[PDB]
């Protein structure tokens, strides 16, 4: 049935400054800005407190599937806050029984050439989503680092280079190869 009211709060940290054009939260701080439009979620994004300390998300007369959005908006905002403060660092380790997947970034992070996967002549170039910057790490031999503010864009761009390196017409229980996401962390922890 219709639930007379539901809500949540998201305590923004004093480092960050969030502002909301109606239903379009813009979060800015140390690393940069992140906007996100929730026109499509249908909620009361209040922003209360002196020092602007917390974001409050109401949702009046919701049925069960409407009340599921309440939390999700809050969570995306959390991730948006994180991305502005710390940032996201997805580490992904290359795997192979033979063909040592030769990775090499190109323009800056942007492009990822993935040569000699399974002995294939076909070089897999893979773009990144704007803002995300791939980089080949040190202190770990076969391993990539994807950093960026917007988690969505980072994790998708990881998935691009995970699915790029896929094995066709074989027993994938046997042929375990490719670049896979090993650790989803931040750029800086505090």
């Amino acid at each position: 049935m219709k639930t007379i009211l539901s809500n949540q709060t998201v305590d923004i940290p004093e480092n960050v400054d969030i502002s909301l054009k109606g239903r379009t939260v813009i979060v800015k701080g140390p690393r940069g800005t992140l906007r996100r439009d929730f026109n499509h979620i249908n909620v009361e994004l209040s922003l209360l407190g002196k020092k602007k300390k917390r974001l409050r998300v109401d949702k009046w007369w919701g049925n069960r599937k409407e009340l599921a959005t309440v939390r999700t908006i809050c969570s995306h905002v959390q991730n948006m806050i994180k991305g502005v403060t710390l940032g996201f660092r997805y580490k992904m380790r290359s795997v192979y029984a033979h063909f040592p997947i030769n990775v090499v970034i190109q323009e800056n992070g942007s492009l990822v050439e993935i040569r000699n996967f399974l002995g294939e002549k076909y070089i897999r170039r893979v773009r990144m989503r704007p803002g995300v910057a791939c980089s080949v790490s040190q202190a770990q031999k076969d391993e990539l680092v994807l950093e960026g503010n917007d988690i969505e864009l980072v994790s998708n761009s990881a998935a691009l280079i995970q699915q790029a390196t896929t094995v066709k017409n074989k027993d994938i229980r046997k042929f375990l190869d490719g670049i896979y996401v090993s650790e989803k962390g931040t750029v800086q922890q505090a």
Binding site: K2, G22, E44, S46, W61
Partner: protein
């Protein structure tokens, strides 16, 4: 981003129905879509009333959620809602609209004549202003 609420003791204007064009304090909320309502001073008997037909003002007079009519009458008269309502812009444009409907054909003619002149005096002022402003631009 709401400013007006179905609160106990909110005065509301009944848009339409039998008790149209009347103020009414919400006594208590019965349901999703039905309020138990009163307007002692506005000639509206205690009864249930659907929210559909009532649009709600910016006047929350304070009484407890299921008082016995006497007390809401006192809260109405204490705040002097009838006087406050009439002074509001809303009530004035209701009054305006009523007057326009009542307007007789002689009255109508009088207005026509009055506007005919009144707009002409504005029009000359506007044209002059524009030409002078043209003078400022030059």
């Amino acid at each position: 981003v709401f400013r007006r609420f179905v609160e106990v003791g909110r005065v509301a204007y009944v848009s339409f129905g039998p008790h149209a064009g009347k103020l009414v304090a919400i006594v208590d909320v019965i349901d999703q879509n039905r309020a138990l309502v009163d307007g002692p001073c506005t000639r509206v008997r205690r009864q249930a009333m659907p929210f559909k037909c009532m649009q709600l003002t910016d006047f929350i007079l304070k009484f407890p959620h299921s008082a016995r009519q006497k007390y809401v009458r006192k809260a109405w008269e204490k705040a002097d809602i009838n006087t406050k309502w009439a002074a509001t812009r809303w009530a004035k444009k209701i009054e305006a609209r009523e007057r326009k409907a009542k307007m007789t054909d002689f009255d109508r003619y009088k207005v026509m004549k009055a506007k005919k002149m009144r707009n002409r005096i504005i029009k000359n002022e506007v044209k002059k202003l524009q030409r002078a402003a043209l003078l400022k631009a030059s």
